[PDB]
Amino acid sequence: PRGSHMLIIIGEKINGTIPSVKKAIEAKDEKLIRDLALRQSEAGADYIDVCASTSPELEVETLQWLMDIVQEATDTPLCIDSPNPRAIQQVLLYAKRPGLINSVSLEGDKCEVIFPLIQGTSWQVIALTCDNSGIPQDVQSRVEIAQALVEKAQSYDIAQERIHIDPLVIALSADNGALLKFAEATRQIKANYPMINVTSGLSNISFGMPLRKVVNQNFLTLAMFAGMDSAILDPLNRDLLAALLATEALLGRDKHCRNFANAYRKNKIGPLK
Amino acid sequence: HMLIIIGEKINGTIPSVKKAIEAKDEKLIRDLALRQSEAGADYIDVCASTSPELEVETLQWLMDIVQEATDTPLCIDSPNPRAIQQVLLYAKRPGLINSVSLEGDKCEVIFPLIQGTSWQVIALTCDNSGIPQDVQSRVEIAQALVEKAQSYDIAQERIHIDPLVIALSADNGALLKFAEATRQIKANYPMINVTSGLSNISFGMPLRKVVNQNFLTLAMFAGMDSAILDPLNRDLLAALLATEALLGRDKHCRNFANAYRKNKIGPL
């Protein structure tokens, strides 16, 4: 298919919601963070997500700390993850090179703050298909919100190719059509905007189910075949990485299956040696 | 509809099974039969894979032992239409035949036997020249099979067309071509079944089990209706059941939650 490319990976591990990362933040233990940055970059991450998950008054200093330790360790660009657009505004200048912003939506002033910040730069943006009413109730509302986001971005000269639209997959336990609806939203959005990226996290699909890792991995395989361009995930999860690379090969994107053969040769997938 | 599972383990190419048939170890065969049905098989494949002169007696033995253990119907697997003729009457109930194609006299022998019965048939998209070289030739051979079948009043519902997936390591469009053939076949014949084995996709690759499992997920999304597989592989069965839920076929994710409670999937 026109415009096929390897899945863009956003490495999720440097997030203060994870207890081990929360403690390293408290200590200014540069070592655990450096290491997460290195190992994710070595596993093929394209971006390193940084999320403070602290009290609001320590968020700006914590992001700045996480940013500095990541960038001392690796040139793989940052994904600045904050729910507070002001925090993103106050840390963007600490990045050595343009990356990804996680995220805007039509809620509040998210677009009004972040779009002028990245206008005229090569920063990219995740855009969630939700607004002041919360999570939309059907496919068509997601597609319409997508259109609204793209049009507001364009008013700041931000091209479709810089936007990763997240159409907000539902828990399969709450709606058995969750993936089917994800694929249909994806189809409509990419038809309207051929140069845009569609993105997702992998874990919301499996809430309320057992063996969540298994459900997440099959979601990833199917979402990829449905047209997903990027995802936020854990590239150090060796079974997930094996699924990801197997699917790439199966979708015809890994010439002679070399990438898969290698990751097997170098022991990055398969039984741990 | 839920993926139809043809349980592949009772096959004399597997050294423990070849041993069992030489020893007449009934217990091993009955165990494979029963556990495969418990794991959700809709059919139990039996394949002698002996010399041609012992094939008919070996199938008859396998069929007798399997049917002592389970009421799940048989899939009689032979490349010799005469062996299938000579054992069909040993089945207590109609099952599946694996397989016919346009080669030789496969259809001319097997279709009169199953005319007027409820036996189903696997039909491979190949002919006397061997494996087709493209998607269109597979699609045309499927149409030729359906027409031949219809001349014997065999409805589309009874047919499982196998469009013969090639190795991904030989052709990096293998899955994409399988999906396109499946799509066109199902478009032309919405009531037909599409079927495949899983192993051929992964020949020549490392971690074949991972490749095979991702193939199954993708193939299901493309419209595959049945597959010949090992339902005793707990990773593959978890993948299979997760994909059924993901494709909206498992009301309230019940079968998946059950299989995890009844410990058919997940950590032993």
Coordinates of C-alpha atoms in Angstrom, one line a residue:
Chain A
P1 CA 0.0 0.0 0.0
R2 CA 1.1 3.6 -0.9
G3 CA 3.0 5.2 2.0
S4 CA 3.9 2.0 3.9
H5 CA 6.7 2.3 6.4
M6 CA 7.9 0.5 9.5
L7 CA 5.9 1.2 12.7
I8 CA 7.2 4.3 14.5
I9 CA 8.0 3.2 18.1
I10 CA 7.5 5.6 21.1
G11 CA 9.3 3.9 24.1
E12 CA 7.0 4.2 27.1
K13 CA 9.3 3.2 30.0
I14 CA 10.4 6.6 31.6
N15 CA 7.1 7.3 33.2
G16 CA 6.7 8.4 37.0
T17 CA 3.5 6.3 37.1
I18 CA 5.9 3.3 37.3
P19 CA 7.0 2.7 40.9
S20 CA 10.7 2.1 40.1
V21 CA 10.8 5.3 38.0
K22 CA 9.0 7.3 40.7
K23 CA 11.8 6.4 43.2
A24 CA 14.6 7.2 40.8
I25 CA 13.0 10.6 40.3
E26 CA 13.0 11.2 44.2
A27 CA 16.7 10.3 44.4
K28 CA 18.0 12.0 41.2
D29 CA 19.4 8.4 40.5
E30 CA 20.6 9.3 37.0
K31 CA 21.5 5.6 36.4
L32 CA 18.2 3.8 36.1
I33 CA 16.9 6.6 33.8
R34 CA 20.1 6.6 31.6
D35 CA 19.7 2.9 31.4
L36 CA 16.0 3.0 30.3
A37 CA 17.0 5.5 27.7
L38 CA 19.8 3.4 26.3
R39 CA 18.0 0.1 26.3
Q40 CA 14.9 1.5 24.6
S41 CA 17.0 3.2 21.9
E42 CA 18.9 0.0 21.4
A43 CA 15.6 -1.9 21.0
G44 CA 14.6 0.4 18.2
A45 CA 12.7 3.2 19.9
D46 CA 12.3 6.2 17.6
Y47 CA 11.3 8.5 20.5
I48 CA 11.8 8.3 24.3
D49 CA 8.7 9.3 26.2
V50 CA 9.4 11.3 29.4
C51 CA 6.5 11.7 31.9
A52 CA 7.1 13.2 35.4
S53 CA 3.8 12.0 37.1
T54 CA 4.7 14.1 40.1
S55 CA 2.8 16.8 41.9
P56 CA 2.1 19.7 39.5
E57 CA 4.5 22.1 41.3
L58 CA 7.4 19.7 40.7
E59 CA 6.5 18.7 37.1
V60 CA 8.6 21.3 35.3
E61 CA 11.8 20.7 37.2
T62 CA 11.3 16.9 37.0
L63 CA 10.8 16.9 33.2
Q64 CA 13.8 19.1 32.8
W65 CA 15.8 16.6 34.9
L66 CA 14.5 13.6 32.9
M67 CA 15.2 15.5 29.6
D68 CA 18.8 16.3 30.6
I69 CA 19.6 12.7 31.7
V70 CA 18.0 11.1 28.6
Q71 CA 19.8 13.5 26.2
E72 CA 23.1 13.0 27.8
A73 CA 22.6 9.2 27.2
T74 CA 21.1 9.1 23.7
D75 CA 20.4 11.2 20.6
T76 CA 17.0 9.5 20.1
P77 CA 14.6 12.3 20.3
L78 CA 12.3 13.0 23.2
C79 CA 8.5 12.6 23.5
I80 CA 7.5 15.2 26.1
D81 CA 4.5 13.6 28.0
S82 CA 2.4 16.0 30.1
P83 CA -1.2 16.7 30.7
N84 CA -0.4 20.3 31.3
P85 CA 0.3 22.4 28.2
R86 CA 2.0 25.1 30.4
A87 CA 4.6 22.4 31.5
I88 CA 5.4 21.6 27.9
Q89 CA 5.7 25.3 27.1
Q90 CA 8.2 25.7 29.9
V91 CA 10.4 22.7 29.0
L92 CA 10.5 22.7 25.2
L93 CA 13.7 24.8 25.0
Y94 CA 15.6 22.2 27.1
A95 CA 15.4 19.8 24.1
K96 CA 18.6 19.6 22.0
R97 CA 16.6 18.7 18.9
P98 CA 13.0 18.5 17.9
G99 CA 10.9 15.5 18.9
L100 CA 7.3 14.6 19.8
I101 CA 4.7 16.2 22.1
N102 CA 2.3 13.9 24.0
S103 CA -0.4 15.4 23.5
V104 CA -3.0 17.9 22.5
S105 CA -6.8 17.4 22.0
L106 CA -9.7 19.8 21.6
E107 CA -10.0 20.0 25.4
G108 CA -9.3 23.3 27.1
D109 CA -6.4 25.4 25.7
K110 CA -4.3 22.5 24.6
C111 CA -4.2 23.5 20.9
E112 CA -4.1 27.2 21.7
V113 CA -0.9 26.8 23.7
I114 CA 1.0 24.0 22.0
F115 CA 0.3 24.9 18.3
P116 CA 1.9 28.4 18.5
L117 CA 4.8 26.8 20.5
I118 CA 5.7 24.4 17.6
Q119 CA 4.7 26.6 14.7
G120 CA 7.7 27.1 12.4
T121 CA 9.6 24.2 14.1
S122 CA 9.9 20.5 13.2
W123 CA 8.3 19.3 16.4
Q124 CA 5.7 16.6 15.9
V125 CA 2.4 16.3 18.0
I126 CA 0.2 13.5 19.2
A127 CA -3.5 14.6 18.9
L128 CA -6.2 12.8 20.8
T129 CA -9.7 12.7 19.3
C130 CA -11.5 14.0 22.4
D131 CA -12.8 17.4 23.5
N132 CA -14.5 19.2 26.5
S133 CA -17.2 16.5 26.6
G134 CA -14.7 13.7 27.2
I135 CA -14.3 10.6 25.1
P136 CA -16.4 10.5 22.1
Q137 CA -19.3 8.1 21.8
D138 CA -18.9 6.7 18.3
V139 CA -16.7 6.5 15.2
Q140 CA -18.0 9.5 13.3
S141 CA -17.4 11.9 16.3
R142 CA -13.8 10.7 16.3
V143 CA -13.4 11.3 12.6
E144 CA -15.0 14.8 12.9
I145 CA -12.7 15.7 15.8
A146 CA -9.7 14.5 13.8
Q147 CA -10.8 16.9 11.0
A148 CA -11.1 19.7 13.5
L149 CA -7.6 19.1 14.8
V150 CA -6.0 18.9 11.4
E151 CA -7.7 22.1 10.4
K152 CA -6.6 24.0 13.5
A153 CA -3.1 22.7 13.1
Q154 CA -3.0 23.9 9.5
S155 CA -3.9 27.5 10.6
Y156 CA -0.4 27.3 12.3
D157 CA 1.2 25.8 9.1
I158 CA 1.6 22.4 10.9
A159 CA 1.5 19.8 8.1
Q160 CA -0.4 16.5 8.3
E161 CA 2.9 14.6 8.3
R162 CA 3.7 16.1 11.7
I163 CA 0.5 14.9 13.4
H164 CA -0.2 11.5 15.0
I165 CA -3.9 11.2 15.5
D166 CA -5.0 8.9 18.4
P167 CA -8.6 7.8 17.9
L168 CA -8.8 6.4 21.4
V169 CA -9.5 2.7 21.4
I170 CA -12.0 1.5 24.0
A171 CA -11.7 -1.6 26.3
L172 CA -12.8 -4.7 24.4
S173 CA -14.5 -5.8 27.7
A174 CA -16.7 -2.7 27.5
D175 CA -17.3 -2.8 23.7
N176 CA -16.6 -6.0 21.7
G177 CA -16.3 -3.9 18.5
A178 CA -13.4 -1.9 19.9
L179 CA -10.8 -3.0 17.4
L180 CA -13.2 -3.1 14.5
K181 CA -14.1 0.6 15.3
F182 CA -10.5 1.5 15.7
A183 CA -9.8 0.1 12.2
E184 CA -12.8 1.9 10.7
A185 CA -11.7 5.2 12.3
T186 CA -8.2 4.7 11.1
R187 CA -9.4 3.9 7.5
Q188 CA -11.5 7.1 7.3
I189 CA -8.9 9.4 8.8
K190 CA -6.0 8.2 6.6
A191 CA -8.4 8.4 3.5
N192 CA -9.0 12.0 4.3
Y193 CA -5.4 12.7 5.3
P194 CA -3.0 10.4 3.4
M195 CA 0.1 11.9 4.8
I196 CA -1.0 11.8 8.5
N197 CA 0.0 9.3 11.1
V198 CA -2.5 7.2 13.2
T199 CA -1.1 6.3 16.7
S200 CA -2.3 4.3 19.7
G201 CA -1.2 2.9 23.1
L202 CA -1.5 -0.8 23.4
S203 CA -2.9 -1.3 26.9
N204 CA -6.4 0.2 27.0
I205 CA -7.8 -2.5 24.7
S206 CA -7.3 -5.2 27.3
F207 CA -8.6 -3.6 30.5
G208 CA -10.9 -6.0 32.4
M209 CA -9.4 -9.1 30.6
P210 CA -7.0 -11.7 31.8
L211 CA -3.6 -12.3 30.1
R212 CA -3.5 -8.6 29.1
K213 CA -0.1 -9.0 27.4
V214 CA -1.4 -11.5 25.0
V215 CA -4.5 -9.3 24.2
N216 CA -2.2 -6.3 23.8
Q217 CA 0.1 -8.2 21.4
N218 CA -2.7 -9.4 19.1
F219 CA -4.2 -5.9 19.2
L220 CA -0.8 -4.6 18.0
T221 CA -0.7 -7.1 15.1
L222 CA -4.2 -6.3 13.9
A223 CA -3.9 -2.5 14.4
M224 CA -0.8 -2.7 12.2
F225 CA -2.6 -4.5 9.4
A226 CA -5.4 -1.9 9.9
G227 CA -3.0 0.9 9.1
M228 CA -1.5 2.1 12.5
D229 CA 1.7 4.2 11.8
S230 CA 3.1 4.7 15.4
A231 CA 2.6 3.3 18.8
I232 CA 3.6 4.0 22.4
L233 CA 4.8 0.7 23.9
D234 CA 7.5 -1.1 25.8
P235 CA 10.2 -2.2 23.4
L236 CA 12.0 -4.1 26.1
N237 CA 9.2 -6.7 26.3
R238 CA 10.7 -9.4 24.3
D239 CA 7.5 -11.3 23.3
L240 CA 5.9 -8.0 22.1
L241 CA 9.1 -7.1 20.2
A242 CA 9.0 -10.5 18.5
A243 CA 5.3 -10.0 17.5
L244 CA 6.1 -6.4 16.2
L245 CA 9.0 -7.6 14.1
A246 CA 7.2 -10.8 12.8
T247 CA 4.3 -8.5 11.7
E248 CA 6.5 -6.1 10.0
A249 CA 7.9 -9.0 7.9
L250 CA 4.4 -10.4 7.3
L251 CA 3.2 -7.0 6.1
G252 CA 6.0 -7.1 3.5
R253 CA 8.0 -4.3 5.1
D254 CA 11.2 -6.3 6.1
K255 CA 13.0 -7.1 2.8
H256 CA 14.3 -10.7 3.0
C257 CA 13.1 -10.8 6.6
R258 CA 16.7 -9.4 7.5
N259 CA 15.6 -7.3 10.4
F260 CA 13.8 -10.3 12.0
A261 CA 16.7 -12.6 11.3
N262 CA 19.1 -10.2 12.9
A263 CA 17.1 -9.4 16.0
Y264 CA 17.1 -13.2 16.4
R265 CA 20.9 -13.5 15.7
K266 CA 21.7 -10.7 18.2
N267 CA 19.4 -12.5 20.8
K268 CA 17.1 -9.4 21.1
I269 CA 14.2 -11.8 20.4
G270 CA 13.7 -15.5 21.1
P271 CA 14.7 -17.4 24.3
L272 CA 17.0 -15.2 26.5
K273 CA 20.6 -16.5 26.2
Chain B
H1 CA -18.5 -17.2 12.9
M2 CA -15.8 -18.6 15.1
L3 CA -12.7 -20.1 13.4
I4 CA -13.2 -23.8 12.6
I5 CA -10.3 -25.8 14.0
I6 CA -8.9 -28.9 12.4
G7 CA -6.6 -30.6 15.0
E8 CA -3.4 -31.7 13.3
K9 CA -1.6 -33.9 15.9
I10 CA -2.5 -37.5 14.8
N11 CA -0.1 -37.6 11.8
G12 CA 2.4 -40.4 11.3
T13 CA 5.1 -38.0 10.2
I14 CA 5.4 -37.2 13.9
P15 CA 7.9 -39.7 15.4
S16 CA 5.9 -40.4 18.5
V17 CA 2.8 -41.1 16.4
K18 CA 4.7 -43.3 13.8
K19 CA 5.8 -45.3 16.9
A20 CA 2.3 -45.6 18.3
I21 CA 1.0 -47.0 15.0
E22 CA 3.9 -49.6 14.8
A23 CA 3.3 -50.6 18.5
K24 CA -0.6 -50.2 18.2
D25 CA -0.4 -47.9 21.2
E26 CA -4.1 -47.1 21.4
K27 CA -3.7 -45.0 24.6
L28 CA -1.5 -42.4 23.0
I29 CA -3.9 -41.9 20.0
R30 CA -7.0 -41.7 22.3
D31 CA -5.2 -39.1 24.4
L32 CA -4.3 -36.9 21.4
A33 CA -8.0 -37.2 20.1
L34 CA -9.5 -36.3 23.4
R35 CA -7.2 -33.5 24.4
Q36 CA -7.5 -31.9 20.9
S37 CA -11.3 -32.0 21.2
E38 CA -11.2 -30.5 24.7
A39 CA -9.0 -27.7 23.4
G40 CA -11.8 -26.9 21.0
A41 CA -11.1 -28.9 17.8
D42 CA -14.1 -29.2 15.4
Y43 CA -12.4 -32.0 13.5
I44 CA -9.6 -34.5 14.3
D45 CA -7.1 -35.0 11.4
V46 CA -5.9 -38.5 10.9
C47 CA -2.9 -39.0 8.5
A48 CA -1.2 -42.4 8.2
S49 CA 1.9 -41.2 6.5
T50 CA 3.1 -44.8 6.2
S51 CA 4.1 -46.7 3.0
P52 CA 1.2 -46.7 0.5
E53 CA 0.5 -50.4 1.0
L54 CA -0.1 -49.9 4.8
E55 CA -2.1 -46.6 4.4
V56 CA -5.7 -48.0 4.2
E57 CA -5.3 -50.4 7.2
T58 CA -3.5 -47.7 9.2
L59 CA -6.2 -45.1 8.6
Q60 CA -8.8 -47.6 9.6
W61 CA -7.0 -48.3 12.8
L62 CA -6.6 -44.6 13.6
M63 CA -10.3 -43.9 12.8
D64 CA -11.4 -46.8 15.0
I65 CA -9.3 -45.5 18.0
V66 CA -10.1 -41.8 17.6
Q67 CA -13.9 -42.6 17.5
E68 CA -13.6 -44.6 20.8
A69 CA -12.3 -41.4 22.4
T70 CA -14.4 -38.7 21.0
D71 CA -17.5 -37.8 19.0
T72 CA -15.7 -34.8 17.3
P73 CA -15.8 -35.8 13.6
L74 CA -12.8 -37.0 11.6
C75 CA -10.8 -35.2 9.0
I76 CA -9.5 -38.0 6.7
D77 CA -6.1 -36.8 5.4
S78 CA -4.6 -38.6 2.5
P79 CA -3.0 -37.7 -0.9
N80 CA -4.6 -40.9 -2.4
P81 CA -8.3 -40.6 -3.3
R82 CA -8.6 -44.4 -3.4
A83 CA -7.5 -44.7 0.3
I84 CA -10.2 -42.1 1.1
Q85 CA -12.8 -44.2 -0.8
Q86 CA -11.7 -47.3 1.0
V87 CA -12.0 -45.8 4.5
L88 CA -15.0 -43.4 4.4
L89 CA -17.4 -46.1 5.6
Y90 CA -15.4 -46.5 8.8
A91 CA -16.5 -43.1 10.0
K92 CA -19.6 -43.2 12.3
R93 CA -20.6 -39.7 11.2
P94 CA -19.8 -37.2 8.4
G95 CA -16.5 -35.3 8.7
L96 CA -14.0 -33.5 6.5
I97 CA -11.9 -34.8 3.6
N98 CA -8.3 -33.4 3.2
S99 CA -8.1 -32.9 0.3
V100 CA -9.1 -32.5 -3.4
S101 CA -7.6 -30.3 -6.1
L102 CA -7.8 -30.1 -9.9
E103 CA -5.0 -32.6 -10.0
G104 CA -5.5 -36.1 -11.5
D105 CA -8.8 -37.6 -10.6
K106 CA -9.1 -36.2 -7.1
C107 CA -12.5 -34.5 -7.8
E108 CA -13.8 -37.3 -10.0
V109 CA -13.2 -39.9 -7.3
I110 CA -14.1 -37.9 -4.2
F111 CA -17.1 -35.9 -5.4
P112 CA -19.3 -38.9 -6.3
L113 CA -18.5 -40.4 -3.0
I114 CA -19.7 -37.4 -1.0
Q115 CA -22.6 -36.4 -3.3
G116 CA -25.8 -36.5 -1.4
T117 CA -24.0 -36.7 2.0
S118 CA -23.0 -34.1 4.5
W119 CA -19.2 -34.7 4.2
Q120 CA -17.1 -31.5 3.7
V121 CA -14.1 -31.2 1.6
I122 CA -10.8 -29.2 1.6
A123 CA -10.0 -28.1 -1.9
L124 CA -6.5 -26.9 -2.7
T125 CA -6.1 -24.3 -5.5
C126 CA -3.6 -26.3 -7.6
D127 CA -3.8 -28.4 -10.7
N128 CA -1.7 -30.8 -12.8
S129 CA 1.0 -28.1 -13.3
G130 CA 1.6 -27.7 -9.6
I131 CA 1.5 -24.7 -7.3
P132 CA -0.1 -21.7 -9.1
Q133 CA 2.3 -18.8 -9.7
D134 CA 0.0 -15.8 -8.8
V135 CA -3.1 -14.6 -7.2
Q136 CA -5.3 -14.6 -10.3
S137 CA -4.5 -18.2 -11.1
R138 CA -5.6 -19.3 -7.5
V139 CA -8.8 -17.3 -7.8
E140 CA -9.6 -19.0 -11.2
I141 CA -8.8 -22.5 -9.9
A142 CA -11.2 -21.8 -6.9
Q143 CA -14.0 -20.9 -9.4
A144 CA -13.2 -24.1 -11.4
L145 CA -13.5 -26.2 -8.1
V146 CA -16.8 -24.6 -7.1
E147 CA -18.3 -25.3 -10.6
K148 CA -17.1 -28.9 -10.5
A149 CA -18.5 -29.3 -7.1
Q150 CA -21.8 -27.8 -8.1
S151 CA -22.1 -30.4 -10.9
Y152 CA -22.4 -33.0 -8.1
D153 CA -24.7 -30.7 -6.0
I154 CA -22.0 -30.0 -3.4
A155 CA -22.9 -26.6 -2.0
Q156 CA -20.3 -23.9 -1.3
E157 CA -20.9 -24.1 2.5
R158 CA -19.3 -27.7 2.3
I159 CA -16.1 -26.4 0.7
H160 CA -13.0 -25.2 2.2
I161 CA -10.8 -23.5 -0.3
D162 CA -7.0 -23.5 0.5
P163 CA -5.3 -20.8 -1.6
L164 CA -1.8 -22.3 -0.7
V165 CA 0.2 -19.7 1.2
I166 CA 3.9 -19.5 0.2
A167 CA 7.0 -19.1 2.4
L168 CA 7.5 -15.4 3.5
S169 CA 11.3 -16.0 3.2
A170 CA 10.8 -16.9 -0.5
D171 CA 8.2 -14.1 -1.2
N172 CA 7.9 -11.1 1.2
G173 CA 4.3 -10.5 -0.2
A174 CA 3.2 -14.0 0.9
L175 CA 0.7 -12.9 3.5
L176 CA -0.4 -9.9 1.5
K177 CA -1.1 -12.3 -1.5
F178 CA -2.9 -14.8 0.7
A179 CA -5.2 -12.0 2.0
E180 CA -5.9 -10.8 -1.5
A181 CA -6.8 -14.3 -2.8
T182 CA -9.0 -14.8 0.3
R183 CA -10.6 -11.4 -0.2
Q184 CA -11.4 -12.1 -3.8
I185 CA -12.6 -15.7 -3.2
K186 CA -14.9 -14.7 -0.3
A187 CA -16.2 -11.7 -2.4
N188 CA -17.2 -14.1 -5.3
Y189 CA -18.5 -16.8 -2.9
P190 CA -19.6 -15.3 0.4
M191 CA -20.8 -18.7 1.7
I192 CA -17.5 -20.6 0.9
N193 CA -14.9 -21.4 3.6
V194 CA -11.3 -20.3 3.3
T195 CA -8.7 -22.5 5.1
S196 CA -5.0 -22.9 5.5
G197 CA -2.3 -24.5 7.5
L198 CA -0.1 -22.2 9.5
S199 CA 3.5 -23.8 9.0
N200 CA 4.2 -23.1 5.4
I201 CA 4.4 -19.3 5.9
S202 CA 7.4 -19.6 8.3
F203 CA 9.7 -22.0 6.4
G204 CA 13.2 -20.6 6.3
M205 CA 12.8 -18.2 9.2
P206 CA 13.8 -18.4 12.8
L207 CA 11.2 -18.6 15.7
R208 CA 8.7 -20.3 13.4
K209 CA 6.1 -20.5 16.2
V210 CA 6.0 -16.7 16.6
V211 CA 5.7 -16.2 12.8
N212 CA 3.0 -18.8 12.5
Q213 CA 1.0 -17.2 15.4
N214 CA 1.2 -13.7 13.9
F215 CA 0.2 -15.2 10.5
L216 CA -2.9 -16.8 12.1
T217 CA -4.0 -13.4 13.6
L218 CA -3.6 -11.6 10.3
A219 CA -5.2 -14.4 8.3
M220 CA -8.2 -14.4 10.6
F221 CA -8.5 -10.6 10.1
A222 CA -8.3 -11.2 6.3
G223 CA -11.3 -13.5 6.4
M224 CA -9.9 -17.1 7.0
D225 CA -12.7 -19.3 8.2
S226 CA -10.8 -22.5 9.1
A227 CA -7.3 -23.7 9.8
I228 CA -5.4 -26.9 10.4
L229 CA -3.3 -26.4 13.5
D230 CA -2.2 -27.7 16.9
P231 CA -4.7 -26.6 19.5
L232 CA -2.5 -28.1 22.3
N233 CA 0.0 -25.3 21.7
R234 CA -1.2 -23.0 24.6
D235 CA 0.5 -19.8 23.1
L236 CA -1.2 -20.4 19.7
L237 CA -4.6 -21.2 21.3
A238 CA -4.3 -18.0 23.5
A239 CA -3.5 -16.0 20.3
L240 CA -6.4 -17.7 18.4
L241 CA -8.9 -16.9 21.3
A242 CA -7.6 -13.3 21.8
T243 CA -8.1 -12.7 18.1
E244 CA -11.6 -14.1 18.1
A245 CA -12.5 -11.6 20.9
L246 CA -10.7 -8.8 19.0
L247 CA -12.6 -9.5 15.9
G248 CA -15.9 -9.0 17.8
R249 CA -16.8 -12.8 17.8
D250 CA -16.6 -13.6 21.4
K251 CA -19.6 -12.1 23.2
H252 CA -18.4 -10.3 26.4
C253 CA -15.0 -12.0 25.9
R254 CA -16.5 -15.1 27.6
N255 CA -14.8 -17.9 25.9
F256 CA -11.5 -16.2 26.5
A257 CA -12.2 -15.7 30.3
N258 CA -13.4 -19.3 30.5
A259 CA -10.4 -20.8 28.8
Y260 CA -8.2 -18.9 31.2
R261 CA -10.2 -20.1 34.2
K262 CA -10.4 -23.7 32.9
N263 CA -6.6 -23.3 32.5
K264 CA -6.6 -24.1 28.8
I265 CA -4.5 -21.0 28.3
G266 CA -2.0 -19.0 30.3
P267 CA 0.7 -20.2 32.7
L268 CA 0.2 -23.9 33.5

